[PDB]
Write an enzyme that holds these catalytic residues in place. Structure first.
Site, PDB file in Angstrom:
ATOM      1  N   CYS A   1       2.484  -2.620   3.170  1.00  0.00           N
ATOM      2  CA  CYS A   1       1.789  -2.663   2.345  1.00  0.00           C
ATOM      3  C   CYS A   1       0.397  -2.109   2.418  1.00  0.00           C
ATOM      4  O   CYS A   1      -0.223  -2.315   3.591  1.00  0.00           O
ATOM      5  CB  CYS A   1       1.595  -3.948   1.689  1.00  0.00           C
TER       6      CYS A   1
ATOM      7  N   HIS B   1      11.434  -2.797  -1.336  1.00  0.00           N
ATOM      8  CA  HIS B   1      12.525  -2.240  -2.021  1.00  0.00           C
ATOM      9  C   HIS B   1      12.608  -0.629  -1.656  1.00  0.00           C
ATOM     10  O   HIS B   1      11.662  -0.171  -0.946  1.00  0.00           O
ATOM     11  CB  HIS B   1      12.156  -2.522  -3.451  1.00  0.00           C
ATOM     12  N   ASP B   2      13.666  -0.067  -2.210  1.00  0.00           N
ATOM     13  CA  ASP B   2      13.876   1.377  -2.201  1.00  0.00           C
ATOM     14  C   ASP B   2      12.993   2.190  -3.162  1.00  0.00           C
ATOM     15  O   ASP B   2      12.245   1.586  -3.681  1.00  0.00           O
ATOM     16  CB  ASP B   2      15.597   1.675  -2.552  1.00  0.00           C
TER      17      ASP B   2
ATOM     18  N   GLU C   1       3.605  -2.688  -8.548  1.00  0.00           N
ATOM     19  CA  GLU C   1       2.826  -2.060  -7.601  1.00  0.00           C
ATOM     20  C   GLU C   1       2.038  -0.722  -8.420  1.00  0.00           C
ATOM     21  O   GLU C   1       1.061  -0.357  -7.637  1.00  0.00           O
ATOM     22  CB  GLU C   1       3.600  -1.692  -6.464  1.00  0.00           C
TER      23      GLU C   1
HETATM   24  C1  HEM Z   1      -1.326 -10.550  -1.747  1.00  0.00           C
HETATM   25  C2  HEM Z   1       0.094 -10.429  -1.361  1.00  0.00           C
HETATM   26  C3  HEM Z   1       0.450  -9.176  -1.262  1.00  0.00           C
HETATM   27  C4  HEM Z   1       1.914  -9.169  -0.746  1.00  0.00           C
HETATM   28  C5  HEM Z   1       2.574 -10.039   0.103  1.00  0.00           C
HETATM   29  C6  HEM Z   1       2.133  -7.647  -0.864  1.00  0.00           C
HETATM   30  C7  HEM Z   1       3.520  -7.278  -0.273  1.00  0.00           C
HETATM   31  C8  HEM Z   1       3.976  -6.010  -0.441  1.00  0.00           C
HETATM   32  C9  HEM Z   1       5.310  -5.407   0.018  1.00  0.00           C
HETATM   33  C10 HEM Z   1       6.297  -6.210   0.641  1.00  0.00           C
HETATM   34  C11 HEM Z   1       5.340  -3.911  -0.282  1.00  0.00           C
HETATM   35  C12 HEM Z   1       6.693  -3.007   0.106  1.00  0.00           C
HETATM   36  C13 HEM Z   1       7.181  -2.823  -0.957  1.00  0.00           C
HETATM   37  C14 HEM Z   1       7.835  -1.508  -0.991  1.00  0.00           C
HETATM   38  O1  HEM Z   1       8.941  -1.183  -0.629  1.00  0.00           O
HETATM   39  O2  HEM Z   1       7.185  -0.556  -1.437  1.00  0.00           O
HETATM   40  C15 HEM Z   1       4.225  -3.674  -0.899  1.00  0.00           C
HETATM   41  C16 HEM Z   1       3.813  -2.465  -1.375  1.00  0.00           C
HETATM   42  C17 HEM Z   1       2.580  -2.050  -2.072  1.00  0.00           C
HETATM   43  N1  HEM Z   1       1.703  -2.815  -2.056  1.00  0.00           N
HETATM   44 FE1  HEM Z   1       1.381  -4.759  -1.717  1.00  0.00          FE
HETATM   45  N2  HEM Z   1       1.237  -6.907  -1.144  1.00  0.00           N
HETATM   46  C18 HEM Z   1       0.146  -7.617  -1.895  1.00  0.00           C
HETATM   47  C19 HEM Z   1      -0.631  -7.489  -2.489  1.00  0.00           C
HETATM   48  C20 HEM Z   1      -1.126  -6.164  -2.836  1.00  0.00           C
HETATM   49  C21 HEM Z   1      -2.305  -5.768  -3.738  1.00  0.00           C
HETATM   50  C22 HEM Z   1      -3.139  -6.811  -4.467  1.00  0.00           C
HETATM   51  C23 HEM Z   1      -2.506  -4.347  -3.598  1.00  0.00           C
HETATM   52  C24 HEM Z   1      -3.202  -3.611  -4.273  1.00  0.00           C
HETATM   53  C25 HEM Z   1      -4.342  -3.824  -5.374  1.00  0.00           C
HETATM   54  C26 HEM Z   1      -1.206  -3.967  -3.189  1.00  0.00           C
HETATM   55  C27 HEM Z   1      -0.690  -2.514  -3.360  1.00  0.00           C
HETATM   56  C28 HEM Z   1       0.642  -2.103  -2.789  1.00  0.00           C
HETATM   57  C29 HEM Z   1       1.246  -0.834  -3.075  1.00  0.00           C
HETATM   58  C30 HEM Z   1       0.324   0.332  -4.049  1.00  0.00           C
HETATM   59  C31 HEM Z   1       2.283  -0.702  -2.659  1.00  0.00           C
HETATM   60  C32 HEM Z   1       3.343   0.538  -2.787  1.00  0.00           C
HETATM   61  C33 HEM Z   1       3.386   1.242  -1.478  1.00  0.00           C
HETATM   62  C34 HEM Z   1       4.627   2.365  -1.637  1.00  0.00           C
HETATM   63  O3  HEM Z   1       5.326   2.295  -2.393  1.00  0.00           O
HETATM   64  O4  HEM Z   1       4.659   3.185  -0.758  1.00  0.00           O
HETATM   65  N3  HEM Z   1      -0.441  -4.894  -2.643  1.00  0.00           N
HETATM   66  N4  HEM Z   1       3.109  -4.796  -1.064  1.00  0.00           N
HETATM   67 MN   LIG Z   2      10.185   0.376   0.463  1.00  0.00          MN
END
Ligand code: HEM
Ligand SMILES: [Mn+2]
Ligand SMILES: *[C@@H]1O[C@H](CO)[C@@H](O[C@@H]2O[C@H](CO)[C@@H](O[C@@H]3O[C@H](CO[C@H]4OC[C@@H](O)[C@H](O[C@H]5O[C@H](CO)[C@@H](O)[C@H](O)[C@@H]5O)[C@@H]4O)[C@@H](O)[C@H](O[C@H]4OC[C@@H](O)[C@H](O)[C@@H]4O)[C@@H]3O)[C@H](O)[C@H]2NC(C)=O)[C@H](O)[C@H]1NC(C)=O
Ligand SMILES: *[C@@H]1O[C@H](CO)[C@@H](O[C@@H]2O[C@H](CO)[C@@H](O)[C@H](O)[C@H]2NC(C)=O)[C@H](O)[C@H]1NC(C)=O
Ligand SMILES: *[C@H]1O[C@H](CO)[C@@H](O)[C@H](O)[C@@H]1O[C@H]1OC[C@H](O)[C@H](O)[C@H]1O
Ligand SMILES: *[C@@H]1O[C@H](CO)[C@@H](O)[C@H](O)[C@H]1NC(C)=O
Ligand SMILES: *[C@H]1O[C@H](CO)[C@@H](O)[C@H](O)[C@@H]1O
Ligand SMILES: *[C@H]1O[C@H](CO)[C@@H](O)[C@H](O)[C@@H]1O
Ligand SMILES: *[C@H]1O[C@H](CO)[C@@H](O)[C@H](O)[C@@H]1O
Ligand SMILES: *[C@H]1O[C@H](CO)[C@@H](O)[C@H](O)[C@@H]1O
Ligand SMILES: *[C@H]1O[C@H](CO)[C@@H](O)[C@H](O)[C@@H]1O
Ligand SMILES: *[C@H]1O[C@H](CO)[C@@H](O)[C@H](O)[C@@H]1O
Ligand SMILES: *[C@H]1O[C@H](CO)[C@@H](O)[C@H](O)[C@@H]1O
Ligand SMILES: *[C@H]1O[C@H](CO)[C@@H](O)[C@H](O)[C@@H]1O
Ligand SMILES: *[C@H]1O[C@H](CO)[C@@H](O)[C@H](O)[C@@H]1O
Ligand SMILES: *[C@H]1OC[C@@H](O)[C@H](O)[C@@H]1O
Length: 299
Positions: free
Chosen positions: A30, A106-107, A184
């Site tokens: 993330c 995820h994928d 996301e």
């Molecule tokens: C507070 C707990 C949070 C957890 C536990 C968490 C967890 C994760 C996880 C497990 C992924 C991987 C999913 C994937 O396979 O793409 C992910 C992706 C992502 N997260 Fe977080 N996240 C959190 C909060 C946030 C917040 C608040 C933002 C931004 C404002 C954020 C933005 C993103 C984005 C944009 C991705 C996609 C990355 C991609 O697809 O390449 N996350 N997050």
């Molecule tokens: Mn992934």
């Protein structure tokens, strides 16, 4: 940024400098969590993190309210119990376990490869956690030549990612995850949409340079004029954006798209795993950090 640099004021008056992660530090799949850890808002080593620490870091340094991460918190601890094989209570063991495949991770991600992307043998697996420039380029290529993009463009990007993942993943692996990915997508619009535009709340447009800086550098784009959203973003904005993306009209349909890709997605809900289920092994790659160029304390 370092105190006395001026960067952040008057949005974040208590900034800490960027510090590259070491080979033994734990990082997540993330971009948001990694940026927080790189600045010490949450443990620099990415270990033993509580819900309270997470909530305050997002609110005070990213303009993200607690409602936005409520479900994310529940899912992070569900995965922790699943991977460690025991209740984690109020201390997330580390950030790396968040990369457990076909769970929260995820994928068809925007900037990461899939667990079984392009592997020759069914038992092989690769790094599905660290930022991957080539993968991110396939997302950026959809909006080449633009400085901003809307809901329709986002819908196109995710469709292109699903198409590529569906074709490249080892046969039988690809599993679509519209509900989680689009929350996301909402996260992206919430953090890097152009708040300088008068109708930012009704029709948010993502600034491409801000998005690229955040993802590639895993630090904040203050140099580009960005600042945490104020007032802090709430869950309402996120799911609304999520729904709007999936509802946008598709003007270019990529081939080899999974069945049901085009259309509304279900609401994201808490994950659940059976106690008898053994978790897939985590990729052990050292954490990624920007090297072209390397970042300074104020970047
Ligand atoms: C507070 C707990 C949070 C957890 C536990 C968490 C967890 C994760 C996880 C497990 C992924 C991987 C999913 C994937 O396979 O793409 C992910 C992706 C992502 N997260 Fe977080 N996240 C959190 C909060 C946030 C917040 C608040 C933002 C931004 C404002 C954020 C933005 C993103 C984005 C944009 C991705 C996609 C990355 C991609 O697809 O390449 N996350 N997050
Ligand atoms: Mn992934
Ligand atoms: C972030 O946290 C995560 C989660 O904790 C870390 O990942 C985990 O890291 C540990 C190392 O710290 C790693 O553990 C090893 O796994 C080996 C493979 O295990 C599987 O395959 C063989 C099966 O036999 C085994 O099941 C049986 O044994 C285990 C214990 O070994 C038991 O729990 C089961 O109930 C079964 O009875 C399992 O399915 C394993 O061989 C190895 O074992 C040796 O270590 C010490 C003793 O346990 C044992 O006597 C052996 O000498 C050891 O357990 C995990 O595989 C890994 N988890 C995943 C899902 O990848 C991660 O490293 C952290 N990262 C950072 C950067 O902080
Ligand atoms: C990653 O961060 C670096 C350091 O801030 C960026 O490089 C600098 O970018 C500013 C504009 O933000 C330029 O004025 C500097 O001259 C750049 N310095 C160097 C040494 O290149 C870099 O652009 C960021 N990466 C991405 C993809 O946004
Ligand atoms: C674990 O195993 C019990 C039975 O032993 C099932 O009731 C659970 O639902 C759970 O099953 C999953 O995990 C183990 C095997 O891979 C099984 O195929 C899977 O369905
Ligand atoms: C930062 O400090 C200024 C006054 O020095 C204040 O008006 C501003 O609201 C502060 N911002 C935050 C988020 O604390
Ligand atoms: C983002 O949020 C909307 C509304 O809850 C869902 O339809 C979408 O699938 C994604 O979860
Ligand atoms: C987006 O959708 C969620 C439920 O998925 C609502 O709670 C939120 O108000 C927004 O309409
Ligand atoms: C829900 O909220 C988003 C972001 O504010 C809007 O763009 C959308 O039209 C809906 O009203
Ligand atoms: C989910 O929410 C968005 C909010 O405007 C709608 O555009 C979409 O059709 C669905 O109702
Ligand atoms: C039709 O329009 C969408 C955005 O509205 C583009 O992403 C697509 O490439 C085509 O030009
Ligand atoms: C490409 O094709 C899909 C259906 O296969 C359409 O929904 C889309 O509008 C585009 O024309
Ligand atoms: C229109 O644009 C989409 C997304 O860029 C492609 O996947 C499709 O093949 C066509 O080029
Ligand atoms: C697990 O394996 C990776 C590569 O598969 C190594 O780089 C890492 O140090 C650990 O041995
Ligand atoms: C990473 O390392 C390079 C060269 O040492 C510096 O230019 C940069 O400031 C950062 O410290
Ligand atoms: C744009 O509007 C949505 C769909 O009807 C599509 O076919 C058009 O190109």
């Amino acid at each position: 940024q370092e105190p006395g640099s001026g960067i952040g004021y008057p949005y974040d008056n208590n900034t800490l400098p960027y510090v590259a992660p070491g080979p033994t530090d734990s990082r997540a799949p993330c971009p948001a969590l990694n940026a927080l850890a790189n600045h010490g808002y949450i443990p620099h080593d990415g270990r033993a993190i509580s819900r309270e620490t997470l909530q305050n870091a997002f609110l005070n340094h990213m303009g993200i309210a607690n409602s936005v991460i409520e479900l994310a918190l529940t899912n992070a601890f569900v995965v922790c119990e699943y991977v460690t094989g025991s209740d984690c209570g109020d201390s997330l063991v580390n950030l790396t376990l968040l990369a457990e495949p076909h769970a929260f991770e995820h994928d068809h991600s925007f900037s990461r490869k899939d667990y079984k992307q392009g592997v020759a043998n069914s038992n092989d697996f690769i790094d599905n956690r660290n930022f991957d420039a080539e993968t991110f380029q396939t997302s950026l290529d959809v909006v080449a030549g633009k400085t901003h993009f809307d809901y329709a463009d986002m819908n196109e990007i995710r469709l292109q990612r699903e198409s590529l993942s569906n074709e490249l993943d080892f046969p039988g692996w690809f599993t679509e995850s519209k509900p989680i990915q689009n929350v996301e997508s909402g996260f992206i619009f919430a953090l890097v949409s152009d708040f300088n535009l008068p109708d930012n709340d009704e029709n948010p447009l993502v600034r491409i340079d801000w998005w690229k800086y955040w993802f590639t550098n895993e630090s904040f784009p203050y140099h580009l004029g960005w600042h945490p959203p104020s007032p802090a973003r709430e869950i309402e904005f996120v799911t609304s954006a999520s729904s709007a993306v999936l509802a946008a009209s598709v003007t270019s349909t990529p081939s080899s798209l999974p069945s049901g890709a085009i259309g509304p997605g279900a609401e994201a809900v808490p994950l659940s795993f059976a106690s008898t289920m053994t978790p897939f092994l985590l990729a052990t790659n050292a954490p990624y950090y920007a090297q072209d160029p390397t970042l300074g304390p104020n970047d």
